């Protein structure tokens, strides 16, 4: 009656992937909400596996390299994340989905690396306003949260500078294993690489012309045609329109409505193949108090959908009956 009867929860408070302080508070924004309560009420046993501690070096230990900011903090954090995620997914080897709350999106290199160690044939559904696939020398910002996929994609490795501390970050994805939904702010070099290597992608223009139902179907067709593969769902909260998720560092107008976001998560959940979902780029230090509440609320609804919550309702585990209590009903009285 439930596709997933248990799940794990993990916080990853990355904040060295981008300059705005506050993504480290993402996991707590969700712990402080009613998310856990709501999940239990649907009958799912959710275990809080705690937080990963990111490695945050000082400036002297972690100077710019190839224009990257905090690259050694990134490589060390990536390996720590991957080890923990691999551990969790293998103890789990009705499957047990891992729910990850960030943290800026640079965490994805580690979560996918570790996940792929447990499930080498996985596919990735990347829900984001951005491509997050800049190679280091094409990045205008040097911000790691804009590069996480590039280190993972085999076809891109002639464009990644070699670094000794990156050796353990082994590319584990083929371009054919990734699909994007929600794109609306690609850098020119990302567009070039995505098209050159045939990465499946559905931008907001595609969502407008095709409708979200067809986009979801086509994205799943592209990377998981017969639902044979485990799914890594990487959901950047900034994929959603700023009107519903204002508290995030790189907001872009004209995004997915909450309902469109829910449909993506509902369909992914219903495949029975949801293996990891991560939710990135929440920043409770951005915007007004009401902004933060709106963002928290959207995130909670999204994560609930991923775990199988149905907007059309759920049936009670036990159906209550008046007579059992020794109470007289209207119908009964009307007989007398």
């Amino acid at each position: 009656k439930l596709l997933y009867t248990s799940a794990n929860f993990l916080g990853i408070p990355t904040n060295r992937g981008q300059p705005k302080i506050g993504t480290y508070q993402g996991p707590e924004l969700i712990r402080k909400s009613n998310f856990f309560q709501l999940v239990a009420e649907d009958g799912i046993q959710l275990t809080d596996c705690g937080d990963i501690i990111p490695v945050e070096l000082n400036e002297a230990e972690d100077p710019q390299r190839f224009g990257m900011k905090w690259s050694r903090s990134f490589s060390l954090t990536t390996l720590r994340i991957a080890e923990r995620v691999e551990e969790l997914m293998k103890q789990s080897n009705k499957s047990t989905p891992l729910v990850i709350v960030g943290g800026d999106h640079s965490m994805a290199t580690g979560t996918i690396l570790g996940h792929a160690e447990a499930k080498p044939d996985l596919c990735v559904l990347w829900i984001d306003a951005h491509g997050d696939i800049n190679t280091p020398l094409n990045s205008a910002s040097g911000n790691m949260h804009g590069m996480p996929l590039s280190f993972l994609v085999k076809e891109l490795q002639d464009q990644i500078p070699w670094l000794d501390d990156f050796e353990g970050i082994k590319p584990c994805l083929n371009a054919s294993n990734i699909a994007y939904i929600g794109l609306r702010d690609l850098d020119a070099h990302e567009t070039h690489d995505i098209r050159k290597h045939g990465i499946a992608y559905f931008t907001m223009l595609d969502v407008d012309r095709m409708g979200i139902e067809a986009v979801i179907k086509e994205a799943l067709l592209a990377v998981n045609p017969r639902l044979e593969k485990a799914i890594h769902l990487s959901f950047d909260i900034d994929a959603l329109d700023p009107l519903v998720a204002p508290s995030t560092g790189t907001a872009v107008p004209g995004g997915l409505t909450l309902r469109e976001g829910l449909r993506i998560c509902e369909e992914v959940s219903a495949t029975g193949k949801l293996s990891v979902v991560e939710l990135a780029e929440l920043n409770p230090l951005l915007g007004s108090q009401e902004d933060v509440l709106k963002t928290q609320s959207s995130a909670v609804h999204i994560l609930r959908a991923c775990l199988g919550h149905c907007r059309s309702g759920h049936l009670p585990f036990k159906v209550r009956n008046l007579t059992d209590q020794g109470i007289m009903s209207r119908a009964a009285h009307m007989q007398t």
Copy 2:
């Protein structure tokens, strides 16, 4: 040229159906707006029939019974409402629609009861994020605004505790006479009853997959196949997304857009069978000043649509002409 040339307006400031003070100010939020002016400008004669005075007992006179809060205030108020609504609909027996502004949604038991006395074969279109069909012993809150339909539905009467003061509240609806649109927060026991008794329902998931045009058509097909029946349109303002109706007590993200709400009302109005429309759960004491204005504005647009306002425009009652005023036009001058 108009489907309805006159209408009645009635306030019902119920506030004992739920804990948040302020729904009693709903009717005044609409009187203070330009609603009456706008309706007259479309050529409709709208008569303000005043307010019903709810019965509000003190705690000593109205203790909890079967976990219900303010249940005797409810039964007495229900009967007072029904008497007044029946009176209005029978003096009205181009039909004359009654527009009712609440007030929390507990008023619906009385409005439908009285309406059905005048028109026994009516159907109900219930636009709401919530089912409002909890039976008393399944209600977690004890709030009457979450139970109004259960006392009316014949099939549910073996689940309603008998109470002497409820005797005059006679179930007047079959499950086959009700259709929901907009649902997204059903309690488990509501889901059970709705499915068990075959109540037609279209949740936000249905709206997403089918589109609002198909949902409206299917809802009308389910309960009013050949437009033979009078329609009771019960519209909870919280059916609309919180972004357009923030000032309401149980807001739920991912609701109907204003345009989707307008389409429901436009199609219902155009059947020629709109007999009662009630608008529930406005609370001007919730949210910011701008929040209240947004909510007031949405409500006004909704009610105008119900009465036949057309977004594609209306023709003038008398067409003005330059010559009649003894004024020289450009065209005329250009001849000389």
Copy 3:
């Protein structure tokens, strides 16, 4: 690779077309944004042609005439605008689109007049919540921004009072050359004239039932069947929902989403016939600081789309390569 490789930019700070001070700051709201930077980054050469100075007479020199407010300021401003626009379009005779930022919508009489002098067979796509086609004696407000099209439409000239200072304002449009998208607040006499003279129009009701993709196709079919005609795109920011463009003087709920607005502009741009786009009714003096930022942001996204910005990405002008820098890649290292 680009449909338009250069464009001109012109400010028109009209504020005598309506009573609310602040539309004169519209052009500066756009100059202060990153619009110019973003346009250059797409490879378009955009030349700032400065501002037109409106003629603003004092009350004594410009009394009401036929109920019109500031009508002589309007006629003189109209002729000044037309002269400048004609000049620009003829020096331009890959075409070079002119981008105009207002300023209240009364400027349209002049921009279209001047544009038509350069391109007599043009068509007009009018994106607006309002018809802006009231003739003077039917206008309840006397506000010129509600009348700009009436002076231009040949079929309406028997309803325009003759005024000596209006002689040079020659009607240059047939009713068959105009299509509206986005309408939701037509005055009765506008509805009469639009229907009587067969002006193509798609209201928000049409957008709801047909979808924006079909509306755009039908609007272009109506006035530019084989893409033979130059297009004058007149975009009132109030066509967009108040949730995304709050800072404007006559806001109406239930408007186009930003995405729907983008689709209109993308399709118009892609015809290769975009000759003038004007963006009207920005008022930075209305609403909160965040309101103004939202409005500025929507306007920038809209104007970028008009010039050919693609949400699905653009290719780099030069593709960067690691080796050129004498840098060692991961792929290369892995061979050694």
